[PDB]
Each structure stands twice: as C-alpha cells, then as structure tokens.
Amino acid sequence: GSMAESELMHIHSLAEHYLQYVLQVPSQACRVLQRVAFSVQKEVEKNLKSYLDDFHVESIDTARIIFNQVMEKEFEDGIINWGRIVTIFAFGGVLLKKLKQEQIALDVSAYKQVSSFVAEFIMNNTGEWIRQNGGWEDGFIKKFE
Amino acid sequence: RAEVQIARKLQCIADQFHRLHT
Ligand SMILES: [Cl-]
Ligand SMILES: [Cl-]
C-alpha cells in the first residue's frame, strides 16, 4: 500500500542515481548496482553496436517506446531474477546515452524522464518479486557476498 | 529485428549473471 509506494520511490531513487552516474551528473546497493549495471551497458554498447545504430532516439517518447518494446520482449517468458533486473537499469542507461546524442528538443531533464519510465517498468514487472526475494539489501547485495 | 536481437542479448546476459551468482 504505502509499502508499494515506498517500494516504487526507492526503485526510482536507484534508477535516478544509476542514470546520473551514466551521465556524470553532480549507499552500498547503489555502488554495486552502478558497477554491475554499467558492466552490462558497456557489453551491450560494444557487442550490439550495429543494432543500436538502427535507432535514432530523437525524443523522450521514442526512448520510452523503444525501452518498453525491448523490455516487453525480454520479459515475455515471465522470468524474473536479479540478472534480469540489472539489465533493465542497463538498457535505460543505453537509451539515455543515445537520447543525449540524438534528441532534437532541448531537454536538460532527460535522465529524470527516463528514470521515471524505468522505475515504473521495474516496479510493475519485478516489484513483488523483489520483496519476495530479500529486497535490495538481503537479496540483491547478498548475490555478491 | 533489432529489438529482438537486443532483447535476446539482454536475456543471455541476465542468464549469465544468474548462473554465476547461484
Ligand atoms: Cl519517487
Ligand atoms: Cl540472479
């Protein structure tokens, strides 16, 4: 209730902090998440470079459309795990970097807009799973210890 | 086609992580 609302706000903070990191905009889960999500983002940018070059992300709406279409396909089997969750943040960063390169409308707040749709997807698709699987401290961080 | 190969790569990467950490 208030618990689901708190969960979404927490996910939003995680997403905002990750995306800020991605763009060098001025906690332990944040630190480890930033490192692993960025390692994924780098892998994607390097290995799927030609596919990423088939999109021009000229607007926030285009970013949202592509994010959702890709994520929907990724998650169509209904499988959730921390690996899957990490890839959502990563792909959000991938798209934010493209948006910053290709956006036509002046948008200095783009990472805020992207953080919102990324947080909504994470909450809507994986929010219950996260609380059922140890949360960020007793679930996600424990994967590295 | 591009969205499918991206999604499949993310699935593969997610799987790699899952297998490593379990
Ligand atoms: Cl929030
Ligand atoms: Cl996992």
Coordinates of N, CA and C in Angstrom, one line a residue, chain B residues 5-20:
Chain B
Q5 N 17.0 -8.9 -31.3 CA 18.4 -9.3 -31.0 C 18.9 -8.6 -29.8
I6 N 18.4 -7.4 -29.5 CA 18.8 -6.7 -28.2 C 18.2 -7.5 -27.0
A7 N 16.9 -7.7 -27.1 CA 16.2 -8.4 -26.0 C 16.9 -9.8 -25.7
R8 N 17.2 -10.5 -26.8 CA 17.8 -11.8 -26.7 C 19.2 -11.7 -26.0
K9 N 19.9 -10.7 -26.4 CA 21.2 -10.5 -25.8 C 21.1 -10.1 -24.3
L10 N 20.1 -9.3 -23.9 CA 19.9 -9.0 -22.5 C 19.4 -10.2 -21.7
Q11 N 18.5 -11.0 -22.3 CA 18.2 -12.3 -21.7 C 19.5 -13.1 -21.5
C12 N 20.4 -13.2 -22.5 CA 21.6 -14.0 -22.4 C 22.5 -13.5 -21.3
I13 N 22.7 -12.2 -21.2 CA 23.5 -11.6 -20.2 C 22.8 -11.8 -18.8
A14 N 21.5 -11.6 -18.7 CA 20.8 -11.8 -17.4 C 21.1 -13.3 -17.0
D15 N 21.0 -14.2 -17.9 CA 21.2 -15.6 -17.6 C 22.6 -15.9 -17.1
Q16 N 23.6 -15.2 -17.8 CA 25.0 -15.3 -17.4 C 25.2 -14.9 -15.9
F17 N 24.6 -13.7 -15.6 CA 24.7 -13.3 -14.2 C 24.0 -14.2 -13.2
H18 N 22.9 -14.7 -13.6 CA 22.1 -15.6 -12.7 C 22.8 -16.8 -12.4
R19 N 23.4 -17.4 -13.5 CA 24.2 -18.7 -13.3 C 25.4 -18.4 -12.5
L20 N 26.1 -17.3 -12.7 CA 27.3 -17.0 -11.9 C 27.0 -16.9 -10.4

